[PDB]
Each structure stands twice: as C-alpha cells, then as structure tokens.
Ligand binder design. Structure first.
Ligand SMILES: Nc1nc2c(ncn2[C@@H]2O[C@H](COP(=O)(O)OP(=O)(O)OP(O)(O)=S)[C@@H](O)[C@H]2O)c(=O)[nH]1
Ligand SMILES: [Cl-]
Length: 443
C-alpha cells in the first residue's frame, strides 16, 4: 500500500506488490534496476521489465548490458530469463491467443502512466500477484492519489504561476522568447502543440514537437544542443529526459469522456492531475549542481473522477484477455474506483472478440470505438459504419465535411455511426481514420 523509498530483496517474494518511489539522485535506471535484475537472476525468477516508451526501454537495455535480458520491441509471439518490453507491447501480448509466460516478477517503470494499455497491464499484474503467482514492483515518483504537485528535486526549482499562452500570440508574452536557454512546454493536445510550435518557429525558435505517434523518432532530435523549445503532450510525463532549464506548463489536458454511453468527446482543456503536474515539473531541477531551473505554470490541479474513458477502456481490454479457469483480471485497487463496470461486463463472444482486437491492432482505432463496432456484430473489413451515421457525426476537414473515396469506388462524407473525437483530433489522426474508412488499409 504505502510507497517505499528504496529496493530491498524481500520485495521479490510472491504476493508482494510494492510501489517504489525513489528519491532524486538514486539512479533508478543505471543503479537500482540492475540491482533488482541481478537479484532476480540470482533467485532464478522469470522476470519481465515494462518500460512506458521504446525510448525508456532503450535506456534500460543500455543500463542492463551484459545481463541476460531480451528486449522485445514488438508484440510478436515469443516462446533469456529476463524479458524487456513496453507497457503497450505487454498488453498487446496478453490479447494474443497465446499464453504469456508465467512470470513470477513484474517490474513496471513509470507506473503512473494512465493510458489504457498501462492501466490494463497494472490490473493483470496486480491480479497475478494477489493470486500468489508473482511479485511486482511499480516504480513511480507520483503514486496514485498523490496530491503534491511540487515534490523534491536534485536542485531547487523556481516555481511561478503565470499566464501561459493557449493559442498563437503576436505580442504580450516576451518572457517566453527572451529566454536564452532550453524550454520544455507541455500542451494539452497535438493541435494546440502545432499552433504553439508554429508561433515559436515564426519567432525564430528551433522547436521539436513530441506526441505519442511521433515520440520515438522525434525524441532522438532532442539529444543535441540543437533546439530551443520542446513542445510536447503529456507523453513526456513518462520518463522523458531533457537537458532543459525551464518548463512552461499549461497545467491543462484533454479528457476523453464517454457521454451517455453513445460517443467520446475530448473534454477540456481542463486542469491536470497533481501527479501530471509533478511529472511535468519533474523534467527539470535534475542537476544537483545546477540551480535556477524554472517551472512556470498556468493554473491549478484537479483530480480525475470516474468519467475519464481510459479506465473503462482498460476494463474492456481485461475482459477480453483470458486467464486460467476463465478468470478476468481486476484493475489495480487504487484505480478500481475510477470505473463502475464489473469484471466481465465487456467480455465478447469469440468471433466479436477477434474483431475487437483486429480494430485495435490492425485498424488503429481507440479501444472504446473498436468495442462499439465489434459488439454490434460488424466484421473488420465492413467499413459501412464509417459513413451511415447521423449528420451530427460528420467529421469536418478545413471547415467542410471530410470526404473519402471507398475501395468500392464511391465518394462518401465521413459520418461514423459512433463518434469518437480521438479519430479526428489532429491531422495525423484524421488521415489515419480516413485511410481506415476508405477500406484501403488493412494495415
Ligand atoms: N548522460 C548521463 N546522465 C546521467 C547519468 N547519471 C544520471 N544522469 C541523469 O541525471 C538526471 C538525474 O539523475 P537521478 O536523480 O538519479 O534520476 P533517475 O531518473 O533516477 O536517473 P536514471 O534512472 O536516468 S539513471 C537523470 O536524468 C539521469 O538520467 C550519467 O551517467 N550519464
Ligand atoms: Cl499525444
């Protein structure tokens, strides 16, 4: 229950689940993780290590060099004693009709990650631990329920609430561009990031944008002194290391919300959680001999309620991940109260379960949307639902209805039967959903 400040080998005994909240300067990846891994190899424990991103996974692979650790960059079925993969890869593996190894040790890094695949992985793991099959270590500086937006750092951080631009500006924010150092700017969305980055670029700044779809390749560009701003969504809350001296934090996020069980809207921008604010601020103050890092933030914090879609989507995943004796994993208890749904409420019959996973893995659809289409009895290749919805579900592209040529040869207005705002959030999202609706892409 209570987080612990340092690793101790008793945490590796079955039924133990520990939240490890390491102090600044502890060297989690380079010092603590190899100690845990060596002790795991020592006691012949089948172990998996779960990184939030491929960037962190690559950092772990380096830190663990010379140890028998196998890094699985993709969710392909495999079947030397320590596996390494991303949270998302792990959950994708759980969905395959192949049993995942009987790991007796799970190590999850940046275990505060609130994406549905991470929530689902935490529920599966905590269930395996509760059943005496394994031990688990959840590593995070911001465990569930944290209310401290201003935790300790290696060096003191100068915190100041300011007006943070939410749109492009032409004047009135000279403190933004008068800065001569490096700034990480957290924005609530890709579209907002696009508008802010363009404005900084117009002002002569060298900007790198980061988001979930681009993160691995664009994060590489940060590894040099060749930039003035990183403009990033919340994805950089999950262990992204920057050499910066300032964070500009909107303190805002978008929240996917299922309205009346009929549609998903992206509500907000609204205040971030305390954990998110702490992690954003946590990009700086990291050098104990470099004072003066600055955290400029645009508003207050607020805690999630039950209307956030990711926890329902995690239950949709876990209901369709088998265990022995037909068992269904529960959410990790600190998060279980974020949904009203019970284990099994979303468990689909075999053929519709298969379509559900196809829409997610092949179709790149959000979990909620994939579930609506699968549970309606629609097969994966039937794209008619993308066009026969209410006019109220028309997706707009440049202030006119978006239009798609189907592989059958008709031009159709994009009007999905179920509307999930995430498929048309940004240009990259829409482009993908358009290719999906065109029946062109079976991936
Ligand atoms: N390039 C480089 N960076 C280091 C080295 N040791 C620590 N750092 C970086 O200094 C920062 C502060 O270290 P620390 O407080 O221990 O954070 P940490 O997250 O536990 O450190 P780690 O998991 O990345 S090893 C981190 O960003 C860490 O990556 C090092 O040997 N080389
Ligand atoms: Cl993103």
């Amino acid at each position: 229950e209570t987080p612990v400040e340092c690793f101790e080998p008793s945490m590796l005994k079955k039924k133990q689940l520990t939240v490890l909240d390491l102090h600044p300067g502890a060297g989690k990846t380079r010092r603590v993780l190899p100690e845990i891994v060596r002790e795991a190899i020592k006691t012949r424990l089948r172990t998996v290590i779960l990184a939030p991103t491929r960037v962190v996974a690559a950092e772990m692979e380096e830190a663990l060099r010379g140890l028998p650790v196998r890094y699985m960059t993709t969710a392909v079925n495999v079947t030397e004693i320590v596996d390494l993969m991303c949270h998302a890869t792990f959950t994708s593996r759980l969905l395959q009709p192949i049993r995942v190894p009987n790991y007796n040790l799970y190590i999850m890094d940046e275990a505060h990650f609130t994406d549905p695949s991470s929530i689902a992985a935490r529920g599966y793991i905590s269930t395996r631990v509760e059943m005496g099959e394994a031990a688990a270590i959840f590593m995070t500086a911001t465990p569930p329920g944290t209310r401290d937006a201003f935790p300790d750092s290696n060096s003191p951080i100068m915190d100041t609430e300011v007006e943070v631009p939410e749109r492009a500006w032409s004047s009135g924010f000279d403190w933004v561009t008068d800065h001569s150092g490096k700034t990480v700017w957290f924005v609530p969305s890709v579209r907002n990031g696009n508008e802010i980055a363009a404005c900084l670029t117009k002002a002569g700044k060298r900007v790198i944008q980061l988001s979930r779809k681009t993160f691995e390749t664009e994060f590489q560009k940060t590894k040099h002194q060749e930039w003035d701003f990183v403009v990033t969504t919340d994805i950089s809350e999950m262990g992204a290391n920057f050499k910066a001296d300032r964070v500009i934090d909107s303190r805002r996020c978008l929240k996917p919300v299922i309205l009346d069980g009929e549609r998903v809207i992206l509500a907000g921008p609204m205040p971030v959680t305390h954990a998110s604010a702490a992690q954003r601020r946590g990009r700086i103050g990291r050098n104990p001999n470099k004072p003066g890092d600055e955290y400029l933030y645009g508003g207050g914090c607020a805690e999630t309620d039950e209307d956030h879609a990711h926890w329902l989507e995690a239950r949709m995943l876990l209901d369709n991940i088998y265990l022995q004796d037909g068992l269904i994993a529960s959410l990790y208890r600190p998060e279980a109260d974020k949904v009203a749904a019970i284990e099994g409420e979303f468990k689909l019959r075999t053929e519709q379960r298969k379509t559900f996973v196809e829409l997610m893995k092949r179709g790149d659809l959000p979990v909620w949307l994939a579930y609506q289409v699968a549970s309606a009895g629609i097969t994966y290749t039937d794209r008619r639902w993308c066009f026969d919805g209410t006019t109220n579900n028309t997706i707009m592209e440049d202030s006119v209805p978006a239009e798609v040529w189907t592989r059958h040869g008709e031009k159709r207005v994009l009007k999905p039967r179920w509307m999930d705002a995430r498929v048309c959030s940004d240009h990259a999202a829409l482009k993908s959903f358009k290719e999906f609706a065109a029946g062109k892409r079976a991936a």
